[PDB]
Design a protein around this ligand. Structure first.
Ligand SMILES: [Mg+2]
Ligand SMILES: [Mg+2]
Ligand SMILES: [Mg+2]
Ligand SMILES: [Mg+2]
Ligand SMILES: [Mg+2]
Ligand SMILES: [Mg+2]
Ligand SMILES: [Mg+2]
Ligand SMILES: [Mg+2]
Ligand SMILES: [Mg+2]
Ligand SMILES: [Mg+2]
Ligand SMILES: [Mg+2]
Ligand SMILES: [Mg+2]
Ligand SMILES: [Mg+2]
Ligand SMILES: [Mg+2]
Ligand SMILES: [Mg+2]
Ligand SMILES: [Mg+2]
Ligand SMILES: [Mg+2]
Ligand SMILES: [Mg+2]
Ligand SMILES: [Mg+2]
Ligand SMILES: [Mg+2]
Ligand SMILES: [Mg+2]
Ligand SMILES: [Mg+2]
Ligand SMILES: [Mg+2]
Ligand SMILES: [Mg+2]
Ligand SMILES: [Mg+2]
Ligand SMILES: [Mg+2]
Ligand SMILES: [Mg+2]
Ligand SMILES: [Mg+2]
Ligand SMILES: [Mg+2]
Ligand SMILES: [Mg+2]
Ligand SMILES: [Mg+2]
Ligand SMILES: [Mg+2]
Ligand SMILES: [Mg+2]
Ligand SMILES: [Mg+2]
Ligand SMILES: [Mg+2]
Ligand SMILES: [Mg+2]
Ligand SMILES: [Mg+2]
Ligand SMILES: [Mg+2]
Ligand SMILES: [Mg+2]
Ligand SMILES: [Mg+2]
Ligand SMILES: [Mg+2]
Ligand SMILES: [Mg+2]
Ligand SMILES: [Mg+2]
Ligand SMILES: [Mg+2]
Ligand SMILES: [Mg+2]
Ligand SMILES: [Mg+2]
Ligand SMILES: [Mg+2]
Ligand SMILES: [Mg+2]
Ligand SMILES: [Mg+2]
Ligand SMILES: [Mg+2]
Ligand SMILES: [Mg+2]
Ligand SMILES: [Mg+2]
Ligand SMILES: [Mg+2]
Ligand SMILES: [Mg+2]
Lengths: 271, 46, 93
RNA sequence: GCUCGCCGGAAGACCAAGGGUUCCUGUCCAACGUUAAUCGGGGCAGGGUGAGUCGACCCCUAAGGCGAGGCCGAAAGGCGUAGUCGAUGGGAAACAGGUUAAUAUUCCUGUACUUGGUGUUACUGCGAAGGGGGGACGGAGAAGGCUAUGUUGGCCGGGCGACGGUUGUCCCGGUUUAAGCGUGUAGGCUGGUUUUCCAGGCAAAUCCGGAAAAUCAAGGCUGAGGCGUGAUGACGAGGCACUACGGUGCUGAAGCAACAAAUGCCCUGCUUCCAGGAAAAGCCUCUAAGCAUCAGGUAACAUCAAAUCGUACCCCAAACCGACACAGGUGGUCAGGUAGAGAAUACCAAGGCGCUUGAGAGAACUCGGGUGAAGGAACUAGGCAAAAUGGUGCCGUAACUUCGGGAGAAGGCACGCUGAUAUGUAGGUGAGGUCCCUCGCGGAUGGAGCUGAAAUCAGUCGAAGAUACCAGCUGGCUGCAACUGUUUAUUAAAAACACAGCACUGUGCAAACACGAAAGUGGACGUAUACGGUGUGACGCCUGCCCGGUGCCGGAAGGUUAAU
RNA sequence: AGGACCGAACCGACUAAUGUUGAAAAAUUAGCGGAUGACUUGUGGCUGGGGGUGAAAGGCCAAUCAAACCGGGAGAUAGCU
């Protein structure tokens, strides 16, 4: 539920919270937890390689099952959980054999719902099948790009993919980007949309709220000296250049895709 | 006012001690030079 | 079992002081200068063999040598080890 | 030595870091010490640091480091797997009293505890490089229950007062005791037990997870404190006796209760929120290969062991970082009284100090302060500086507003002490007694005693009762930036930067992009509700015209045009 | 509840005076801002010089910064003093 905060202080006036009362209030399932310590956007040379990453809250990594390989064995949804590592919620599912796993929580999935994977699975949300066994027209998510590799497409809160055509070895997918893309029909997909579609409606409301998420400030190129950025310099606010990245590449329309290897599988670019 | 030298023996030995010098070829050259000069103390270790 | 050769090296001297004297009279404890690498086991073994007494317990400490000047020239005395050796009641040394 | 003054959330006490003998004693006063120095952190000599339990080492891991093979790279090297290191974190166990010139949870006294080795005896499925449990975790808030601790009373010892009074509802002091062991309470969590079965936990598993029965519903885990014991002990005001007059030796009363009470403990709890909150070992448990009436396990008892290194001293500082015995800097712990909301502030206690030149004098001028006739911003670039306001309760409070605010708007009234209400109230606490009682650290009742606001009425002193210290000046118009933040360490704190929000744009995942001859790594264990870049900068109303130039995107008839 | 309010510790540095061969190569005194957070602090770690890091001041990178420091090329060169 999307709830506007009352303006009892300047930092609250514009806050809009997304409050889901279904989410488990307790601690997560400890056998499926790992540490993921933070990078500060620094690589193994110790250099910043992505700017604007630092701090924020500590977060345990939940091992989420993107492969959905455990075919034939039904699973019941025990609870939905908050996952700090991603926009989607996750669902703790219990298999009949007593194995527990986390899956991306589809829209509509609730505690008590059954799910199953494999060719024989029913066409209902949460069920994972090879896309050759999914009816053309189906909305799916957590789609594999290579058979066996695990879901890579449509994992973010509220996302999904339509299977729009099948032709031999390949299905064609409409991605959220709008790209039409071919993928092997043996690639698995989970039925339905990723849940937590309200995710996008949150309004952080204050500087600090972005800092909690580990986002450090962006200094505009034009606020700098020439030595620091192509945009830097000027007495007063000047500009008088084509906008570029800090490394001098044009940043307003110039295309940067360069992958001849995967061009064959793009039917139509997002445009 | 806080001045630049804030001593820590652990940091001293890690940054400049004998074993740090021995760990790299450039560090070993430091030791070679200081032996050639005939320093009484090769490193901060002693 | 420590060898008799080793035992013959570990005790270096009795240590003479007011504190050592009070230790002997008050608490039946002899204070020795011992070899710097001597353990409590060796000091006990050595005192029992060489002085023919019964030792209750050994306490030890390392005394750090004093820095000194001998005509504007810095030197340093050696670290040495001191053993407070408590004898059993009745034993005399 | 007696007075005086200063600090007392420190200028006291204990540490870590850092230093390294500065510690104690004797001796010396050249140099050092901003003066003298008989003194010293100075010279010289001697002494002094005692551990199974404190800490390190050690076992365990974090960030990160190194890294057999490996992958990559003109060489040097880079990265990284298995590993192996790496605390600032996890992991066994000791307390009180006494003692030295100088150490003490280390010595001594008393009383404990931990882990491990051997052996003996009894009983017995043991076994890991593997599985599972546990260890194991956030912010905020709220209360209960406690204790540390304090206050008063009682008790004991002492006192009867340099000047009016002081045998009392009077004065001073003391009234302390640990770990451990026993007990299991306020509180917190959780249904329990047995049976059968099973696509999971790489194999196996009796363990964990799952399923289905049956039966029982109180069983377990956890837990401050209290009580008991420890303790017929220790300590103890003081007295008495020596003094080598600094101090030693001897003996020893009371040793209770009530009330208040933490920021400490119960509490790694509970409630709640979103930003969703280490790891690994010790520990517990399960089996595998293996071992078989053996090894090994469990228990009891005995015995042995628990090494090594640190331990002095300073430590908000004359001992560390600042060239100095330097108005500087430096993390943790301890937290008495009166007043007070308080760790503010004032005065004090314990304790510690008077800051290593003094003595006079009482000019100008400078510094730091106090007061000021009449006037009251006339000063000045500018009310700069100063003066002023300043508490609590109650009343009262405009435009405007995003409905929160604005607001402590503005402004007004009260305020001490005494008595009464009421020999101390409302409230809090709660003894005895009485009854019940799964008979206890229980329940009910009961109110003694203790503590104790706030108000009203009456009176009363002063110029003045928020009396000191402490402690908002207020209002009106307007530019800029929405806001809290950030910044030129050392002349700029701002209107600059950032910011939530907005938009454009790139990016289909071996993503774009970035670091990098490369391997790789970050982006991300993310996947278009995502990520990067750019500009704008809350919110409200909005965001027009121009695609020639220069970019970017797309096209392809023709011109021109490289290597070859 | 809160980048909420008043206010110590703690973090800072707006104004003034002093000081300027200082007590101090940036402080003191009186006032001042933040004070549950985009907070602050201890210990350890990582980023390296056309490089880092930068809520961006050309700021900071050991009292040094429009290219650190140390050594070397090196007795650079100096139509200048
Ligand atoms: Mg960014
Ligand atoms: Mg932005
Ligand atoms: Mg600028
Ligand atoms: Mg440029
Ligand atoms: Mg201009
Ligand atoms: Mg122009
Ligand atoms: Mg002993
Ligand atoms: Mg020792
Ligand atoms: Mg005083
Ligand atoms: Mg000396
Ligand atoms: Mg001394
Ligand atoms: Mg003289
Ligand atoms: Mg002199
Ligand atoms: Mg001396
Ligand atoms: Mg190699
Ligand atoms: Mg490596
Ligand atoms: Mg490692
Ligand atoms: Mg290790
Ligand atoms: Mg540690
Ligand atoms: Mg001492
Ligand atoms: Mg008490
Ligand atoms: Mg507090
Ligand atoms: Mg000490
Ligand atoms: Mg002085
Ligand atoms: Mg000083
Ligand atoms: Mg401090
Ligand atoms: Mg004070
Ligand atoms: Mg005068
Ligand atoms: Mg004057
Ligand atoms: Mg005045
Ligand atoms: Mg006047
Ligand atoms: Mg007047
Ligand atoms: Mg007037
Ligand atoms: Mg005027
Ligand atoms: Mg004038
Ligand atoms: Mg002023
Ligand atoms: Mg004033
Ligand atoms: Mg009254
Ligand atoms: Mg104007
Ligand atoms: Mg502003
Ligand atoms: Mg400045
Ligand atoms: Mg300034
Ligand atoms: Mg990738
Ligand atoms: Mg702007
Ligand atoms: Mg605030
Ligand atoms: Mg600053
Ligand atoms: Mg100040
Ligand atoms: Mg404020
Ligand atoms: Mg404040
Ligand atoms: Mg500039
Ligand atoms: Mg500098
Ligand atoms: Mg240059
Ligand atoms: Mg040359
Ligand atoms: Mg020259």
């Amino acid at each position: 539920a999307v709830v506007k905060c009352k303006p009892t202080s300047p930092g609250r006036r514009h806050v809009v919270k997304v409050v889901n009362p279904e989410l488990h209030k307790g601690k997560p399932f400890a056998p499926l937890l790992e540490k993921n310590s933070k990078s500060g956007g620094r690589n193994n040379n110790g250099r910043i390689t992505t700017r604007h990453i630092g701090g924020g809250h500590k977060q345990a990594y939940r091992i989420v099952d993107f492969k959905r390989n455990k075919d034939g064995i039904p699973a019941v949804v025990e609870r939905l959980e908050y996952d700090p590592n991603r926009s989607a919620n996750i669902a703790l599912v219990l298999y009949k054999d007593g194995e527990r796993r986390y899956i991306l929580a589809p829209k509509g999935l609730k505690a008590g719902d059954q799910i199953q994977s494999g060719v024989d699975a029913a066409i209902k949300p949460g069920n994972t099948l090879p896309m050759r066994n999914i009816p053309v027209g189906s909305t799916v998510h957590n789609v594999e790009m290579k058979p066996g590799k695990g879901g890579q497409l449509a994992r973010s809160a509220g996302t999904y993919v339509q299977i729009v055509a099948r032709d031999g070895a390949y299905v064609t997918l409409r991605l959220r980007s709008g790209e039409m893309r071919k993928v092997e029909a043996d690639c698995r997909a989970t039925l339905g949309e990723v849940g937590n579609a309200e995710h996008m409606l949150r309004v952080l409301g204050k500087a600090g709220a972005a800092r909690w998420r580990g986002v450090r400030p962006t200094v505009r190129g034009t606020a700098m000296n020439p030595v620091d950025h192509p945009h830097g310099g000027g007495e007063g606010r000047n500009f008088g250049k084509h906008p570029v990245t800090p490394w001098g590449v044009q940043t307003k329309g110039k295309k940067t895709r360069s992958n001849k290897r995967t061009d064959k599988f793009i039917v139509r670019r997002r445009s | 006012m806080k001045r630049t030298f804030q001593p820590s023996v652990l940091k001293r030995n890690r940054s400049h001690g004998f074993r740090a010098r021995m760990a790299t070829k450039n560090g070993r050259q430091v030791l070679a030079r200081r032996r050639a000069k005939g320093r009484a103390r090769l490193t901060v270790s002693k | 079992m420590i060898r008799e050769e080793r035992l013959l090296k570990v005790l270096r001297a009795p240590h003479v002081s007011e504190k050592a004297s009070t230790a002997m009279e008050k608490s039946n404890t002899i204070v020795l200068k011992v070899a710097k690498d001597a353990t409590k086991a060796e000091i006990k073994a050595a005192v029992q063999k060489l002085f023919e007494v019964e030792v209750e317990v050994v306490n030890t400490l390392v005394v750090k040598g004093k820095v000194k000047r001998h005509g504007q020239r810095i030197g340093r005395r050696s670290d040495w080890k001191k053993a407070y050796v408590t004898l059993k009641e009745g034993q005399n040394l």
